[PDB]
């Protein structure tokens, strides 16, 4: 039950782009604790007890381009 911190570089070009990604991840609450998105930096930060590959696949299935991901 450790909360891990994953960070993704995701191509998002409007508030709708970011809102869509936030929607799909927020649906995983309470297993997702917090989502931060920065349009400036094209970053998605996910704080969660879920595995990295699970989170990555939920983002990829949005159709948004994921340029990188990592665990912090």
Tell me which residues touch Cu ion (CB under 5 A): 13-14, 16-17
Q: Does 14 count as an annotated binding residue?
A: yes
Select from 3, 11, 49, 67 the one that contacts a copy of itself (CB under 8 A): 11
The residue (of 35 and 69) whose beta carbon lies closer to a copy of itself is 35
Nearest-angstrom CA–CA distance, 48 and 38: 18
Does 46 bind a copy of itself (CB under 8 A)? Our answer is no
Q: In Å, what is the CA distance from 41 to each residue of 8, 12, 37, 59, 62?
A: 10, 10, 9, 17, 19
Does 17 bind a copy of itself (CB under 8 A)? Our answer is yes
Does 22 bind a copy of itself (CB under 8 A)? Our answer is yes
């Amino acid at each position: 039950a450790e909360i891990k911190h994953y960070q993704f570089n995701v191509v998002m070009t409007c508030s709708g782009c970011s809102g869509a990604v936030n929607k799909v991840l927020t649906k995983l609450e309470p297993d997702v604790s917090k989502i931060d998105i920065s349009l400036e930096k094209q970053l998605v930060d996910v704080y969660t007890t879920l595995p990295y590959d699970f989170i990555l696949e939920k983002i990829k299935k949005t159709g948004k381009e994921v340029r990188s991901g990592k665990q912090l």
